[PDB]
Amino acid sequence: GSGKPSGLRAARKLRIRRRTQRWADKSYKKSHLGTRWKSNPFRGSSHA
Amino acid sequence: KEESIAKMLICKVHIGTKNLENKMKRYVYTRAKDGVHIINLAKTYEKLQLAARIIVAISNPADVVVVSARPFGSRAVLKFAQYTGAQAIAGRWTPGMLTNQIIQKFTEPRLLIVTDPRTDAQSVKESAYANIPVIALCDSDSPLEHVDIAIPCNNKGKESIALMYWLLAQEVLYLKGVIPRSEPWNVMVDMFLWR
Amino acid sequence: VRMSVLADCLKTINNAEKRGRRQVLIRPSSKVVIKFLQYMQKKGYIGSFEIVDDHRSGKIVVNLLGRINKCAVISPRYDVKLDEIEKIITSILPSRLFGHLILTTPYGIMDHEEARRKHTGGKVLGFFF
Amino acid sequence: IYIPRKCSATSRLIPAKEHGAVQINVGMVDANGVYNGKTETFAISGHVRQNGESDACLNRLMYEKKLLSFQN
Amino acid sequence: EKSSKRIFQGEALLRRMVRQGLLGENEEKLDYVLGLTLPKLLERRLQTKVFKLGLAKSVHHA
Amino acid sequence: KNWVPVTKLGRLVKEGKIVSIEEIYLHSLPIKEYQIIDYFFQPNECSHPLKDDVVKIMPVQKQTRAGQRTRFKAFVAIGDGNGHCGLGVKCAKEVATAIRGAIISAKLSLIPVRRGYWGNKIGDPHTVPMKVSGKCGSVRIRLVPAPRGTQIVGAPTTKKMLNFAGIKDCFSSSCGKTKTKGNFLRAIFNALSKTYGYLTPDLWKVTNFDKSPYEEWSDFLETY
Amino acid sequence: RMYGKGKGISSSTLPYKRKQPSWLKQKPSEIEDAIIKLAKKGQTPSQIGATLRDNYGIPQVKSVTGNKILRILRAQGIATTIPEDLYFLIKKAVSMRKHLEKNKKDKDCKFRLILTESKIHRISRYYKRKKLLPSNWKYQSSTASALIA
RNA sequence: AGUCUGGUGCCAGCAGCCGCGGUAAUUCCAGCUCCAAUAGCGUAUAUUAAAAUUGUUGCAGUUAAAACGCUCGUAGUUGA
RNA sequence: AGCAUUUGUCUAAAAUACUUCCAUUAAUCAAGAACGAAAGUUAAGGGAGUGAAGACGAUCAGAUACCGUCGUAAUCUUAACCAUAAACUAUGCCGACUAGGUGUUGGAUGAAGUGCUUCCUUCAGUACCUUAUGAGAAAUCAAAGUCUUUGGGUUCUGGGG
């Protein structure tokens, strides 16, 4: 590949790089970090 | 045959010089140690006949246009054009002339014959937008780009230009119905060139 | 370091066709490369090829018919099952009408359609159209 | 339906609307070196002309056709 | 061609479409199944037929 | 009608020495005469008459010492609905003038798209015979043929353009900024142009050539 | 090239034929004897091959005998325990370390000394894998004098 | 889908977004007409498409975000 | 990173040459390690000139600045450390294939000027000019090419402000 391994046994690398690099997105950070349930007052409700 | 070859050989036509284009080396014979290139000329003669063969196969010769930017070549193209019924174009090529449809020099030519495609470059460029094969008398420093027919010659002297067009004219007149090939054409040898 | 010759060779052939060479000199030589050229001849893409003998590695000089739009190699050489072939060709080929996807299968190196008609999966090597 | 045509030299297909590629008409000679009726025509793509390989390719093609003897 | 699912499903679909009245007399091949259009489906409706037979004077009246 | 061509190729068409636009495409001749297209697609006699549509009017401005100048670029789409599309572009200070100039450009621009089958010869030609992808500015647009009953899959602009070209069953896709409409149209037009550029097995066969109109009608061409 | 920035291609060309020259029709025993004499004189296999080409005028041993020189030495049981290549590399590294012991400000000598020892480790690991150095074997700079002694 | 009628006058306010309102408002408040969907239609939060904006397919890294200062090297991946 | 006096010594290096040897030993590499400008820190010299700090004279609306003159720390070497810079060819590295010409530096091959000098052919470096029916958002780029016609191998990196 170019900037990616082709490798038949390189599924390991593809998973780890994808897993680390996913976190950079803002929406993803908001969705999977705990801060959502903490700092927001409504915390998974439309209404209060 | 050999008398015509000899006349070319005595003439200055085959004197190539330094700064010679990559493409053209299959027509060069040898590098002189004195910094000049000898041109084979035998291939040039047969190739000139091929150029004549393409020119003759055109239904109207008066749609076949000759071009020279050069002052000294201007008479030679005009005389060559006069005999074969062609239009000669001398000096500036007005850049829109074939392509533009309202310009004074608006022309739909069949074929273009070029004196040095280095000098006559605007016509060469326009010819490629106008789907024209293009014959070109090419020299050491001349492009071979665009043109289908390349004729090797030194084109920096008046006699050389004139001799090649004169020989071409005799060959075309022979291919035409104008005069039998059996007897030499005696008209205006050493006399197309500038004053 | 050089790795798989075949891809660079096919890119060279593609460049040669783009350039308009008519004949070309492959400096690599191998059994698989020879089989691939024989297959391209089978499908009317390549004409004759001459294998020149040197002990270290022969060379191949291939006469081109100019019919190729592209020839290329897929690396890694993925495994592919018979029903998966339809997805692969839909991805790769310019049309389902023409173009050829090449596998290596237990009945030999052959294109996908022939392999499919036969009935064995295998590994994907390349393609041309 | 439209029928496209190909370059004689390279095998390459010539597009409909390209406006640069050419058809070169070559006259056959008669026995005394007069223009015969017949003309052989060959198709040259713009790319080869832009490269400047047209003269070389034409020479190779003429040699194959027996219209030039000197080959290159 | 010559696949069991394909010939079973195709024959079954064509039979069903003929029964519904979507397909014509020699319309018995897959390009006519693709060929179907929204007015033709609408034409199978009872209000359209009632208008067509002349039982009512309009589709809305039907 | 009574209109005057000043090009010789035009004059051949005016007399009817050339049957179709197909021949002019065959010899790849430049077209600077709208009358050729108007003669061939003869509005009340034509099988598939050319249908116009102003797709996009855009403001552009020079900006000057004494202030702004609004000019109008105009993109228009024309097509027979059967095989010949045309995309025309003109910028002028007045909108209607821009539109007319663009329509004249569109006729000159007129290109044949290759129409064939997705696969089997079970009906009529109906879509591009293979993938074409066309680029303009940032935007690279790919048409890839779909099986029958899969008409005009794509954006509204694409649907219209394919309808003018006479393409039915195809998927479209895109890479880059679609929003820039002139580039988007041009990228489609570039792809449509590529259709007779790709080589196909049917074109493995040897080709031999009809002589030029400039040789076929030489006497009449000198005369008129 | 492994560590340099070049890619120089100066090398042995080799003729097409593997057959003997016209000039020399010598028996295998004569060829073995000539090599044995050079080996006995204390010359190392690269030096012997170079000498065999130049001094004795003979095309190389694999062409005129059909078997490699190292293999011939091994068959007679006389082949060297330490590789010729490894010996020169260790000798160069020892030379650099002696120099580095004197001069602590030579950064390039330090840089090359780690580089060459790393090359020795790679070559050693390959020789261990081909079972030409013991399973228990390891390079050490302390014992390196003893290795090439 | 309206250069429709009054009143308000950066105020009141509306409006995912761009915006409208600071005095002859097509965006506000009413009224009129038009338009969309329809016994359902708004609104919010959650979630998918959209997004070839996480990219195996299928991204981007000269100048827009991004080549570790530089080199060796074990694991790793790739190896005529 | 960086490297310009003379001569010597200790060292390494690349290309060339090779009908010399090995016989797959390799490529790129998380971890870890090496070397790493300038300034700074700590110790000895040295403190010429330059000179953060600082001092005056002006300058100016004010000037704690530019300018002028002075001037400690520092600049230099030795001994430790420190571990970053627009540490920039702003382009990760290896590998193939692609296009001309003008040059240029290190070798080898041939010939003619007068053994040598020149030139020719060829290798390994290395720039420029033109051309890219090659690329790109264009600038530009012979790589940023052979990439929606998308996969030679690999490490690292970015995901609106």
PDB file of C-alpha atoms (C1' of nucleotides) in Angstrom, chain H residues 1 11 23 43 49-50 54 56 59 68 77-78:
ATOM      1  C1'   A H   1     -45.689  29.390  -2.606  1.00  0.00           C
ATOM      2  C1'   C H  11     -37.587  48.128  19.003  1.00  0.00           C
ATOM      3  C1'   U H  23     -39.120  54.704   8.941  1.00  0.00           C
ATOM      4  C1'   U H  43     -40.533  19.994  18.128  1.00  0.00           C
ATOM      5  C1'   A H  49     -27.643   7.542   5.692  1.00  0.00           C
ATOM      6  C1'   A H  50     -25.577  11.893   4.047  1.00  0.00           C
ATOM      7  C1'   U H  54     -11.762   7.583   9.842  1.00  0.00           C
ATOM      8  C1'   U H  56      -9.888  -3.057   3.420  1.00  0.00           C
ATOM      9  C1'   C H  59      -8.807   9.760   2.314  1.00  0.00           C
ATOM     10  C1'   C H  68       9.347  11.720  13.952  1.00  0.00           C
ATOM     11  C1'   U H  77       4.953  -6.093   8.606  1.00  0.00           C
ATOM     12  C1'   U H  78       7.115  -6.962   3.635  1.00  0.00           C
TER      13        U H  78
END
